[PDB]
């Protein structure tokens with residue numbers, strides 16, 4: 001119940017929420033059906049529209065008007081935004097030349113430059129270029145401020161998951177808004193775009209920017225706007241708040257436009273109908289900037305123009321139906337559309353089986369436009385698994401397509417949609433920052449929206465709540481207020497074992513034909529085991545181990561490794577392959593060769609008998625024997641300390657990567673440095689497992705089975721310089737491949753590896769930072785580069801999309 005008989009007089013768009021049943025006048029009272037009786041009359045005036053005209057100039061103040069053109073409007077803070085242009089001969093902001101804002105130029109009583117976040121729904125990245133002719137205000141923000149060619153949203157590329165990621169710096173799996181529709185089995189409650197349940201605070205995790213601000217004494221405008229409040233009124237409200245007394249005035253504000261998304265769904269992303277929505281959003285930007293100029297704030301405020309996600313061409317006829325795959329379609333609930341989430345229709349049905357659902361959905365039709373995954377098998381870059389609201393069964397839908405349960409669900413009302421994989425070009429969205437704290441006429445590389453919360457905190461002088469951004473990775477966007485992080489302290493120092501064991505101390509069940517027999521070369525081989533080639537193969541320093549563990553550094557001619565005595569295998573293996581390097585075979589006499597490592601105790605080694613006895617599990621090597629520098633050095637590659645457990649199906653992937661692709665990358669990139677290793681993430685939280693979280697071992701042994709294998713592949717950004725003699729910035733690409741016992745993910749896997757392996761690897765592209773989380777390692781500790789530049793490098797994702 002709401003006693004709507006109270007009044008909004010002098011309360012329009014009040015910032016503090018008054019508690020039920022007293023009636024509300026805040027900018028979300030509509031959504032709660034709780035506005036006071038006179039809210040429309042008082043707070044949503046429209047009389048005479050939104051623009052001053054010549055005849056209105058110097059008018060007698062009529063309180064009924066939507067905005068004012070009387071002499072008193074400036075001191076009242078309620079002029080129409082074009083008042084100074086029409087009535088006082090001023091220019092529109094957009095018509096002014098841009099002039100660098102070197103320092104904030106703020107009115108007296110302003111403690112800090114305010115931040116205004118101008119958010120646009122469905123604003124695809126390419127609209128910035130493609131629509132530039134009809135968006136002069138936005139184009140000026142873009143050209144004169146700091147801009148990225150695009151900003152990567154989070155998956156699923158839907159509205160609420162992205163706006164809330166922008167507000168919190170968190171992945172959806174951590175903030176809890178994992179889709180526009182959700183079921184939470186613990187609450188036994190459903191969240192929907194339309195309705196009231198979504199306003200319940202229990203859905204919304206983390207700490208959004210307005211709460212961060214408020215807790216730290218920085219006042220916030222109320223970010224959410226009811227759909228029925230026109231954009232002109234949203235802008236006027238912001239400008240009015242900006243005229244409050246110092247002690248009452250917010251420092252952070254948000255605007256939201258439901259365009260161009262609204263029209264994009266109807267007309268497609270480049271529908272001819274799309275020009276008008278773009279013109280109209282630009283007009284709204286113009287109104288804000290004119291309004292700031294009137295208030296003398298246009299060289300004081302930091303403005304962020306940011307989108308949630310893009311828009312793709314999608315029509316009803318491009319729908320896959322689960323009824324064409326599953327016998328038992330009525331026993332499942334599907335969350336449909338540009339992604340699929342499947343769970344049992346009834347928890348009482350004990351004939352429900354995820355394994356049979358997955359199999360019935362796997363590579364069943366030749367042109368199949370979705371792929372099923374258990375959520376833990378989704379690309380780790382999506383970070384889309386560690387939440388009870390995410391169903392175990394996920395369908396990744398091809399761009400341009402929908403999935404639905406049955407044809408009757410689809411009945412064409414639409415031409416655009418979004419939600420697809422966040423690396424898809426059509427899903428990319430926009431970022432521009434303009435103001436004293438942003439750089440002038442600066443283009444920055446694409447970056448992820450999870451990074452922005454940190455920066456918004458920087459812009460406001462706030463300490464960010466713990467989040468998934470990498471603070472300092474976006475320092476290059478900023479003129480001042482940079483955050484100068486220090487590298488994390490190494491927690492575990494390595495041991496550097498020498499030769500401590502005789503061959504006969506080992507009883508590993510391994511054999512090698514290596515007893516094939518010199519003071520010239522013997523001193524030189526001793527040098528290699530002591531680290532004399534380490535500077536060639538470990539180019540950016542040893543990775544730091546950021547947790548408590550026991551491990552050894554092992555040096556070799558061709559590779560260096562950090563060998564874990566706890567996990568019985570390397571945490572990392574580092575090696576450099578020059579452009580000139582030659583690939584060779586594993587010699588016939590060495591096919592099954594495994595060699596005890598006389599630096600490492602039998603008790604801390606793997607054994608070959610475990611692999612013999614495990615009929616599902618084989619092994620591979622982290623440093624590839626194919627890339628040995630010489631016949632003699634090749635023996636090092638067969639050390640038991642370079643061995644890792646691999647399913648035969650996975651070995652197909654790994655062997656092709658090592659035998660074919662590493663060389664190809666070294667040819668293309670002018671040498672590469674490779675760091676490879678295992679990852680254990682059995683609880684799919686994106687974080688390194690402890691020893692007691694491992695669910696699978698090589699049968700009979702304490703050898704833990706990796707859930708994934710990573711590689712970080714680094715070279716010189718200036719590829720005229722070889723990877724091992726690089727003077728400047730680095731270039732990186734990485735992957736986190738799932739360690740799976742089948743290649744069911746790759747529908748073309750019965751073909752030669754040249755037709756499917758690299759495609760798999762591309763899907764599983766990763767940031768170095770993703771690998772850091774998954775391993776507790778910190779990379780690039782010793783470069784000639786600034787730490788902020790290295791943080792940016794660590795957040796880079798190589799996407800393989802066209803331009």
Ligand SMILES: *[C@@H]1O[C@H](CO)[C@@H](O[C@@H]2O[C@H](CO)[C@@H](O[C@@H]3O[C@H](CO[C@H]4O[C@H](CO)[C@@H](O)[C@H](O[C@H]5O[C@H](CO)[C@@H](O)[C@H](O)[C@@H]5O[C@H]5O[C@H](CO)[C@@H](O)[C@H](O)[C@@H]5O)[C@@H]4O)[C@@H](O)[C@H](O[C@H]4O[C@H](CO)[C@@H](O)[C@H](O)[C@@H]4O[C@H]4O[C@H](CO)[C@@H](O)[C@H](O)[C@@H]4O)[C@@H]3O)[C@H](O)[C@H]2NC(C)=O)[C@H](O)[C@H]1NC(C)=O
Nearest residue numbers: 173174175176204205206386387388466467468685686773
């Ligand atoms: C992205 O960045 C984020 C933010 O930094 C990272 O997330 C953090 O990761 C930490 C490790 O997973 C995690 O720390 C745990 O916190 C537990 C207390 O959590 C509450 O308090 C915080 C602080 O205010 C709050 O933010 C939390 O909010 C979560 O839960 C509510 C629902 O109640 C949601 O509204 C919200 O969205 C969020 O959910 C998300 O996280 C939870 C896990 O916390 C998931 O379950 C969800 O799926 C969702 O993703 C909470 O309200 C604390 O209890 C934990 O302590 C256990 O483990 C430590 C190990 O040090 C040990 O000392 C203790 O013994 C303890 O174990 C006991 O409980 C076990 C579980 O029941 C039990 O098995 C044991 O036997 C013990 O009894 C732990 O410290 C931190 O909460 C989150 N923070 C957030 C905001 O998500 C994230 O890792 C980053 N991602 C990547 C890829 O880097």
Ligand SMILES: CC(=O)Nc1ccc(C(=O)CCc2ccc(C(F)(F)F)cc2)cc1N
Nearest residue numbers: 117119163166167223224225226227254256
């Ligand atoms: C069905 C429905 O309610 N759709 C809506 C969805 C969103 C909104 C908003 O007003 C969002 C405001 C906002 C701006 C910026 C951010 C930031 F900073 F994080 F980027 C976060 C939030 C309003 C409506 N009406």
Ligand SMILES: [Ca+2]
Nearest residue numbers: 681687688689
């Ligand atoms: Ca884990």
Ligand SMILES: [Cl-]
Nearest residue numbers: 158179180181
């Ligand atoms: Cl959804």
Ligand code: NA
Nearest residue numbers: 743744746749
């Ligand atoms: Na296959």
Ligand SMILES: [Zn+2]
Nearest residue numbers: 122261265418
């Ligand atoms: Zn939409």
